[PDB]
Amino acid sequence: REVALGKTVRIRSAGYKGQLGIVKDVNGDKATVELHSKNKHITIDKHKLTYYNREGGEGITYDELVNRRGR
Amino acid sequence: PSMILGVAASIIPFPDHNQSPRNTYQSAMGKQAMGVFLTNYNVRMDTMANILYYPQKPLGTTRAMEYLKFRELPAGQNAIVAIACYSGYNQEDSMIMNQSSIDRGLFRSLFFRSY
Amino acid sequence: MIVPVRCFSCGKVVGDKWESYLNLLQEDELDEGTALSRLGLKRYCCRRMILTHVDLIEKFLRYNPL
Amino acid sequence: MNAPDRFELFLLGEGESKLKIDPDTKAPNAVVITFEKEDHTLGNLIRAELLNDRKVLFAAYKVEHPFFARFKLRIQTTEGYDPKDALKNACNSIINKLGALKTNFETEWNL
Amino acid sequence: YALATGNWGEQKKAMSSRAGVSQVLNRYTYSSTLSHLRRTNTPIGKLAKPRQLHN
Amino acid sequence: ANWPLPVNIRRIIQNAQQTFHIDHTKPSDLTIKDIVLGVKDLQENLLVLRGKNEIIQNAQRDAVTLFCCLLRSRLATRRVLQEYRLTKQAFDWVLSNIEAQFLRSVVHPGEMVGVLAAQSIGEPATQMTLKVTSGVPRLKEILNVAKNMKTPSLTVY
Amino acid sequence: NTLFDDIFQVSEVDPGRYNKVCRIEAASTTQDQCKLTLDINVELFPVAAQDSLTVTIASSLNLEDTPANDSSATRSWRPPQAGDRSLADDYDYVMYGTAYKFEEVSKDLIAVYYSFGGLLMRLEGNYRNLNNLKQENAYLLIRR
Amino acid sequence: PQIGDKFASRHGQKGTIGITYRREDMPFTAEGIVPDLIINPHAIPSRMTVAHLIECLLSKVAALSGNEGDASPFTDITVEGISKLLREHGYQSRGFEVMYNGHTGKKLMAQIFFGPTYYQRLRHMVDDKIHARARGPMQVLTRQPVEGRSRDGGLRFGEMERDCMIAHGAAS
Amino acid sequence: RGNLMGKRVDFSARTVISGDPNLELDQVGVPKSIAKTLTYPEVVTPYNIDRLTQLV
Amino acid sequence: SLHKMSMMAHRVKVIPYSTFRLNLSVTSPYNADFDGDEMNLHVPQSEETRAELSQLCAVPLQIVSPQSNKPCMGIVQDTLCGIRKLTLRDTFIELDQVLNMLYWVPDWDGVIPTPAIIKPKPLWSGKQILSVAIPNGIHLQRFDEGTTLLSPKDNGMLIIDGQIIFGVVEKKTVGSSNGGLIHVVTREKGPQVCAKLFGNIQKVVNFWLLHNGFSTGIGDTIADGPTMREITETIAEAKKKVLDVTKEAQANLLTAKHGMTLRESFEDNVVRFLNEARDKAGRLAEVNLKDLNNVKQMVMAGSKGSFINIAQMSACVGQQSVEGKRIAFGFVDRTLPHFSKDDYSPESKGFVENSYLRGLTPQEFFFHAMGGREGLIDTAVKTAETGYIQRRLVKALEDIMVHYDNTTRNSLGNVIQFIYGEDGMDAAHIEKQSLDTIGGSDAAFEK
Amino acid sequence: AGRAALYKEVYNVIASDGSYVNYRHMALLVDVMTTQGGLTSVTRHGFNRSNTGALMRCSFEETVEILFEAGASAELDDCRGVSENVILGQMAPIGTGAFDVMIDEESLVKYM
Amino acid sequence: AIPKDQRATTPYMTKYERARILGTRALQISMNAPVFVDLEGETDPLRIAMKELAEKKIPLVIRRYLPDGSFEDWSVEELIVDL
Amino acid sequence: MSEEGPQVKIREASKDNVDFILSNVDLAMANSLRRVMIAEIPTLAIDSVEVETNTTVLADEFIAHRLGLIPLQSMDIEQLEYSRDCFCEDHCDKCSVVLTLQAFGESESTTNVYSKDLVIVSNLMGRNIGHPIIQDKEGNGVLICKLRKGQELKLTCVAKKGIAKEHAKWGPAAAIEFEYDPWNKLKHTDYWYEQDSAKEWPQSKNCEYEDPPNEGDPFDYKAQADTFYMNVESVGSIPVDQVVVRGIDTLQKKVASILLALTQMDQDKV
Amino acid sequence: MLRSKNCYLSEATESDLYKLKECPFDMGGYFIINGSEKVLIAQERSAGNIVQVFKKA
Ligand SMILES: [Mg+2]
Ligand SMILES: [Zn+2]
Ligand SMILES: [Zn+2]
């Protein structure tokens, strides 16, 4: 149901701007996104973080709900 | 006379100026030191493997370990040590480490695990 | 494995002096201390950075790559 | 993993302010000021400049724990002198001294 | 089996055979491997005399 | 003469002297009869058993003999009127404090005295260091009740 | 306010095991009983053998503004400012301490012990009349 | 490396990191050199580890001179020779240095021993030993918490803990 | 002795200890992860209902 | 968990790092260091259990140990050295540091004490700040050797109304002593007051030591030329005496002590002479050391070290012995192949002449290795035997209780003691006192 | 006299190194070990051979022998010992368990 | 059997008794149970229990068991709390 | 000569080191200046590294750390906004600088990779930032990695503004020498000695700028520390004079921020 | 066991060892069975054919 599941995302704003990670568990509004360089998990709002492609490409906002797809 | 010691005891500098239990403890705990165990790594699949980022040869070298290839495969680093009572946070056996040195790559290492 | 970029204690950049140190040691024919002084390292914190450094990168490069 | 983030020692978060003054009931005309995200850099300067004042009867600072970048400053002034006025005067004197030092250093380096 | 389990003998009568004869080589540092390759053991199966350092 | 005892009389009298600001020069208001009666009342007020029959009364009487000796030694008339000079109020305060401390120092029923004794004996044994046998082997042979100890000995006077 | 005054010629200064505190022995140059043993900070107030140091014990340091009318207890001592003249102006060494012992040396000689922090003073008088107004905390003033 | 990691010297002087300070907070000498590690002096007299100080002095002299130092046992190297070499380099006979406080900048009353020392990082780290359980996996036979940290096990309440709690009197 | 005299219990933690001069005598520094893992049941009652709801 | 102090109830304080942090004075009952030790934590799950732990197993409630009738906690490590250095008579502090030190005290009322010296420069003694940390209402008086009301050696201790008058603060005052400050504070005021005193003293001493500094070095173990010459002369004299004893024994002129053979008495004399020589050399080395020596300062404070350590590090290492006897003849009438047969000289039998600073020859190095091996074996065996003995003792006395009739009975109800301790007194509420009536002479008693 | 000599020997052993132990603990130990007419060694053949509870005795050593003997004979475990309560998982009658707490009506109607 | 009012135990409250009553009262207040004192801005059950015990307003009865089997009932209000 | 407060006297000037004497200033201000110059000056350094291909014998984290430790030019660091304060998504030309490094092994001998091989691909908009600092005579720079034939290293970096407090890689100063009172006139320290103090303790190089103490003179208890000798060494990202100026400016900015917060809260509370 | 007469690495030079992905600093002396290196610990025993006489209790 939730689009944000297993898709590589980039953290925007806050103290982790520009970081790359993969969201593992999503519940309610907060989304748990792991970190690549850092071995820790940070929970942030799904709307704030942008969405990228698994292989690589342009980044998009949380408008994936309208598109109902990836990339 | 210095050849009466073993492989582990040949690493200790000035062992004649130290108490025997201290030498025994150092010999026992030397095997747990972190360093480049072999140059064949990155080609071997071992269950555990720890490699120091920047291994450094000791300043106080001994003639005995020249044949043990310790200077070619060191298992430690040379760090500036000050013996002082600063802030009272290093009592008993605790020690105080510089954050800048750690950030610059002091004593950091790699961990390898194979499944 | 490879020479550190910066000195651990203070932070002086010593990663650009390894080749010069080797060249001084191999044809200029002087002891390590005078070569270190010539390079520009005056504190023993910086001197120990390259005086007690082992270059294991060559051993790794000896193996055939992909 | 329990490593605090490296930006928490100099960045103000949410819900907390840089300054916080609470009146002290132990002594008259005494207040306690809590600074968040600074330590051991400007606190010593503030304490020294307050001690340089003649209407300040007490000036000290301390850091409760190195883990958290915060310190508490206690000022006791003579009757009729608000501690906030003393703090403002000390800050102004520090600003003037720093400006003079910068100007002198620039003048010396110019030649 | 004898080289792997370390019990010097056949699969049967393992409990009556010596244990620890064969051990996994310790590869954590060069000194540890060198010390492990030059190690001896005294099978004792309470007594301080055999453990003391003799002249 | 130095033996462990429940209540420290010297600390109590020093605290009373410090908190009452004795002049050490003015004559005291205490009387010999009052001092003796107060000492006797304090001695009779120390209860450890709180029984009504003869056996329990005798046990309570003879279970505080050392403390009574110490109290009599530290509260003699000559000592009070020469060295530790207190007034009537200070003397009453000292007596009340002594009684309260003695009552608060009594053991509490329900304590695991056996486990406490076992631990208090075993800790020095673990902390014990290295011709008469002594140390860990001697303690082991004492606890096990060995019929043939390594080093028997005799002492004849 | 003043409770004592003498010349107290000093002799036999003992350096001791310290480097900033010296224990000295003195003797009045008037009464033939007064003796004084005092520890002083020679770093701030150097003292040599065979020297005369006028000592003075005062209940309070305040001048004629207050005629030693007690008070001034636990006032949270403040740094001195311009003016506010006190008895310390005349003297060169002022110390504050606590009395803790009142041993009687003999039938007429009495001894008073003072503790100025870590430094102790033993003052011995006579007839229990010279050192009669010594009851509690007081200031010690020394003039060169 | 972080707080709790085990670090040991070459003379049996093991220890763990208790606090971590930045460069500014660390004490500094007149030349601006800050130590990488700080060791309490209350560990030398009890263990009588003179070789630690001798090796530190020899390493300092070697770093200053640039030639490798010899620490082989039963040799002719003495403390007086190392002290003379250090004095020739112009630092101190006994290796003491004058340091300044990192918080206020005031000079320290007591001089501080200084010099490089070889240190090794052990295999024991706090990240591989921290455990915490609250109603985890169950056993089959005894229906008691499982064994081991990797299996999310629980701590064992031994007989010593039981009798200590008995002595404490906490029956509930 | 291994299952009745002494057994294994829940709500327990174990880690390397360290010194802290700034902590009081009756105080222990619990790591955040350990505190998060361990829990203590609290009965929902007046005088703490608001705090319990905030924690939930 | 050897004793009841090995497990106690604390208060949770969340910290941002993954390691247990505890006060330094708490480690002593736990017998734990910070070299890799791990310690367990248990969380109560009910209100009654929490109340029981708070009111029975609290840290302040276990200050006084009923085992040795002494406090189980005290000032240790560098805090002891700092409190000894601060209280010294020549230590003076200025206003800028005094204000910070006063503010560091959590329960400071807000009154600045009057400085000891006011006229030349306002200076506060360290004893003044230490007394400020000490709560009011505690009077302590201890007299050491040669201690009077005007003690010049600054020995002993006298506290009036929570104010230090004279005397250096050392292990005998703020340590685990019989009549120390901790015991008096715990007996007079509540345990919370004692815990607050611990915290305040630790904070002020740590701040002062941080802003003062303390170190140690190789030069602290080096003695001057004349002292080393005297030590060498003493060792030579002892060796000459041993040689004379051997020469007398070899001529059958020696007389054996009753109950001993001709060899046991000779060995006893030799070891006695060697031990006396080592003790004399160590005493000379300790006397030669100055007051500014770091090792001497640590030893005097009592935080760490001892006279034997200083002796072995500066003057001479003691003779290596096995099970109390000298090194046995491993070979045929020889200790090592480098010696000759039938050699009874102290050097060949395991006597070390050099110190740790000077370095050891291979023979004494081997002898020291043998001694260390013996020590390790002794510890390994002793720990197991003591564990078994402790388990048996605990299992044999786990059902003994004191009932409401002040009688000590087991589970079966049998009476073992009609009154606990034959006096019915709690162990933790007993102090060592002297009875004046028994002592003294008849004339003095009558007077 | 044997008990006094045993206490003296225990004190000599304890005080040999220099440590101090309160007299009450040693006195309790020697009284327990000499409660009967002779020495009761702290071993399998000593204190573990009394008329105490079967579970408490079996918890120390020789678990199945003691249980077998109890089954063969007619042994009733009155069960107020600490070991029995620990086995049964009940609040032992020690420390805070030596008394029961009850609620009275008169206090309730008087306080309210 | 109950020893009438010729009781012979101690007229004071032991530490174990204090802990047990404090824990029981803390649990009872933690659950929805009446409080016989003025909370006065306290919300921790244990502190409420200590406040109740301050003026002996706890309706609890101590039953001290003799080793034989007899027991005597002691009221909380009549027990002196000196510790 | 601008104002009667602190005074300066430069003993030596250089592109990497500056020697000067501080006068008419207190210990607290000098210590604060030293601390600010150590760990308060903003600097540009590589923060995030994207590794495309790595066939070398070095781990990705190793190369990332080595690249992050490489100094970069920060002359115009005041014209670059903080990443957290920018309105972009991850990075842009107004808040970050993008650098790309490509290396391949063609020659039979080992092919070294130097910091001079880094190429800036973003638009600097005329700002003097992002250029790697090269001070070697050969003009090579910091050795990043060594490659043999057949090995390739392609990766992209982005540089972000930061201070040394967050990470030691942003420090612009290597070592700062701080010293005052070459003679023990203030008695601020006690000299450890065996037989003599002057003989055992070497004289500092700054003893020639102060009058030697006079024997047989009373201890001056009214004298305080007012003269300080400071030497500042720069890594190379920022010149030493600019380092000192930026340190003074940062201290002034912190004090001004404290004053502004005090004024704002006074206005709000009144 | 490694570096024996029947092992391929006995006569191998440094270049051959590097080609065979073997560390030249390796010493051998162990057995490779099931992919895990095994080392035989020397066993200590009393020498035979020796006449020894002891005293009993
Ligand atoms: Mg340990
Ligand atoms: Zn450096
Ligand atoms: Zn941007």
From Swiss-Prot, chain C:
Binding sites annotated in the UniProt record for Zn(2+): 7, 10, 45-46
Main localization, broad class: nucleus
A GO BP annotation: transcription elongation by RNA polymerase I
An example molecular function term from Gene Ontology annotations: DNA-directed RNA polymerase activity
Superkingdom classification of source: Eukaryota
Entry GO CC: nucleoplasm; nucleus; RNA polymerase I complex; RNA polymerase II, core complex; RNA polymerase III complex
The keyword Ubl conjugation belongs to this UniProt entry's keyword annotation: yes
Gene3D superfamilies: Homeodomain-like (1.10.10.60)
Keywords: DNA-directed RNA polymerase, Isopeptide bond, Metal-binding, Nucleus, Ribosome biogenesis, Transcription, Ubl conjugation, Zinc
Alphabetized Pfam families for the sequence: RNA_pol_N (PF01194)
Subcellular location per the Swiss-Prot or TrEMBL entry: Nucleus, Nucleolus
Glycyl lysine isopeptide (Lys-Gly) (interchain with G-Cter in ubiquitin), cross-linked positions: 59
Any further remark recorded for this protein: Present with 5300 molecules/cell in log phase SD medium.
Job description of the protein: DNA-dependent RNA polymerases catalyze the transcription of DNA into RNA using the four ribonucleoside triphosphates as substrates. Common component of RNA polymerases I, II and III which synthesize ribosomal RNA precursors, mRNA precursors and many functional non-coding RNAs, and a small RNAs, such as 5S rRNA and tRNAs, respectively. Pol II is the central component of the basal RNA polymerase II transcription machinery. Pols are composed of mobile elements that move relative to each other. In Pol II, RBP10 is part of the core element with the central large cleft.
Classification via PANTHER family: DNA-DIRECTED RNA POLYMERASES I, II, AND III SUBUNIT RPABC5 (PTHR23431:SF3), DNA-DIRECTED RNA POLYMERASES I, II, AND III SUBUNIT RPABC5 FAMILY MEMBER (PTHR23431)
UniProtKB/Swiss-Prot annotation, chain I:
Disulphide-bonded residues: none
Compartments, as annotated in UniProt: Nucleus
PTM entry text: The tandem 7 residues repeats in the C-terminal domain (CTD) can be highly phosphorylated. The phosphorylation activates Pol II. Phosphorylation occurs mainly at residues 'Ser-2' and 'Ser-5' of the heptapeptide repeat. The phosphorylated form of Pol II appears to carry, on average, one phosphate per repeat. The phosphorylation state is believed to result from the balanced action of site-specific CTD kinases and phosphatases, and a 'CTD code' that specifies the position of Pol II within the transcription cycle has been proposed.
Membrane-spanning parts: none
Domain notes: The C-terminal domain (CTD) serves as a platform for assembly of factors that regulate transcription initiation, elongation, termination and mRNA processing.
Subunit structure: Component of the RNA polymerase II (Pol II) complex consisting of 12 subunits. Interacts with DEF1; the interaction is direct and serves to bridge RPB1 to the Elongin complex in a DNA-damaged dependent manner. Interacts with the Elongin subunit ELA1. Interacts with the Elongin subunit ELC1. Interacts with ASK10. Interacts with ESS1. Interacts with RTT103. Interacts with SHE2.
Family of the protein in this entry: Belongs to the RNA polymerase beta' chain family.
Protein name (database record): DNA-directed RNA polymerase II subunit RPB1
Species name: Saccharomyces cerevisiae (strain ATCC 204508 / S288c)
Gene of this entry: RPO21
UniProtKB/Swiss-Prot annotation, chain L:
Presence of keyword DNA repair: no
Single GO biological process annotation from the record: transcription initiation at RNA polymerase III promoter
Extent of the signal sequence: none
Places the protein is found: Cytoplasm; Nucleus
Gene Ontology, cellular component aspect: cytoplasm; nucleoplasm; nucleus; RNA polymerase I complex; RNA polymerase II, core complex; RNA polymerase III complex
Main location as per UniProt: cytoplasm
Region entry Leucine-zipper, spans: 39-60
GO molecular function, one term: DNA binding
Quaternary context: Component of the RNA polymerase I (Pol I), RNA polymerase II (Pol II) and RNA polymerase III (Pol III) complexes. Component of the RNA polymerase I (Pol I) complex consisting of 14 subunits: RPA135, RPA190, RPC40, RPA14, RPB5, RPO26, RPA43, RPB8, RPA12, RPB10, RPC19, RPC10, RPA49 and RPA34. The complex is composed of a horseshoe-shaped core containing ten subunits (RPA135, RPA190, RPB5, RPO26, RPB8, RPB10, RPC10, RPA12, RPC19 and RPC40) where RPA135 and RPA190 form the DNA-binding cleft.
Leftover remarks: Present with 6090 molecules/cell in log phase SD medium.
Family per similarity comment: Belongs to the archaeal Rpo6/eukaryotic RPB6 RNA polymerase subunit family.
Protein name (database record): DNA-directed RNA polymerases I, II, and III subunit RPABC2
Span of the entire protein shown here: 73 to 155 of 155
Curated annotation (Swiss-Prot), chain N:
Localization in the cell: Nucleus
Subunit structure comment from the entry: Component of the RNA polymerase II (Pol II) complex consisting of 12 subunits.
Family: Belongs to the RNA polymerase beta chain family.
Protein's job: DNA-dependent RNA polymerase catalyzes the transcription of DNA into RNA using the four ribonucleoside triphosphates as substrates. Second largest component of RNA polymerases II which synthesizes mRNA precursors and many functional non-coding RNAs. Proposed to contribute to the polymerase catalytic activity and forms the polymerase active center together with the largest subunit. Pol II is the central component of the basal RNA polymerase II transcription machinery.
Miscellaneous comment: The binding of ribonucleoside triphosphate to the RNA polymerase II transcribing complex probably involves a two-step mechanism. The initial binding seems to occur at the entry (E) site and involves a magnesium ion coordinated by three conserved aspartate residues of the two largest RNA Pol II subunits. Present with 18700 molecules/cell in log phase SD medium.
Name assigned to this protein: DNA-directed RNA polymerase II subunit RPB2
Lineage: Eukaryota, Fungi, Dikarya, Ascomycota, Saccharomycotina
Part of the intact protein present: 173 to 229 of 1224
